Design a binder for this molecule. Sequence first.
Ligand SMILES: Nc1ncnc2c1ncn2[C@@H]1O[C@H](COP(=O)(O)OP(=O)(O)CP(=O)(O)O)[C@@H](O)[C@H]1O
Ligand SMILES: [Mg+2]
Length: 259
Amino acid sequence: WALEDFEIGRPLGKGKFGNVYLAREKQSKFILALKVLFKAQLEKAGVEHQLRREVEIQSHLRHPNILRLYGYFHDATRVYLILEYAPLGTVYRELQKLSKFDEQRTATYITELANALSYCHSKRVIHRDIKPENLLLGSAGELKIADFGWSVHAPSSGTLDYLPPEMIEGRMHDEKVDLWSLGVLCYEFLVGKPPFEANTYQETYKRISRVEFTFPDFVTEGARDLISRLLKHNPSQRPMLREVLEHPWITANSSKPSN
Ligand SMILES: Nc1ncnc2c1ncn2[C@@H]1O[C@H](COP(=O)(O)OP(=O)(O)CP(=O)(O)O)[C@@H](O)[C@H]1O
Ligand SMILES: [Mg+2]
């Protein structure tokens, strides 16, 4: 597997370690996304081994709400990831355009997230880096979790906007990290801002460890209940994904069934 087997198109995104390009395999005309990481940069930090673990985790995951990793190769200087192509962009860009989502879209997206996370937790997998810019949209507008560069196994040990207290406090985290991020996202979808945003890293840190946030008036009581249950300082207090998928506000507003 070499780069000569793909025609490269426009870039789909740019990052510190590399770039993502639309691409087509020449033999079959299969269109896909090619993520080109540069070893030099991955080595400048201690990330090349986290990349190896992320690739091994993602290749064993098959779920309609998880971006597929078809394969991977490398050359002298670059690492190539062969990714499923998500043609409708990121939830982040959708959030900028629409400013905020209504209860129906939010509940649908949370349901799709909770389904995919349930499949991951049912295989001892945490993501930790669930940001809007890592949620992609498929041809039918379905959510796909991408960017598994931070996923890990077991407890284990940028902007903090989506990280729970136990992570910023440097403690040992577990599968409950994904529950906190789910509550951050639910809030951001309805309000248009993550609930602990601030002009400063140091201030954002304080807010998260205190769980200091407030709702705009238009947030309904059902959304407040779900969000307050997820954003608990104590991981063991956060609900299970089953409790989320069966939350009243989710069932009433979600257009997609649960799992
Ligand atoms: N299969 C895919 N289909 C469509 N767009 C994609 C895509 N994969 C990535 N992108 C776009 O490129 C951006 C960055 O890709 P990705 O999040 O996977 O790498 P990354 O976050 O690790 C960047 P860095 O190397 O700096 O850490 C995404 O936010 C998205 O806009
Ligand atoms: Mg990303």
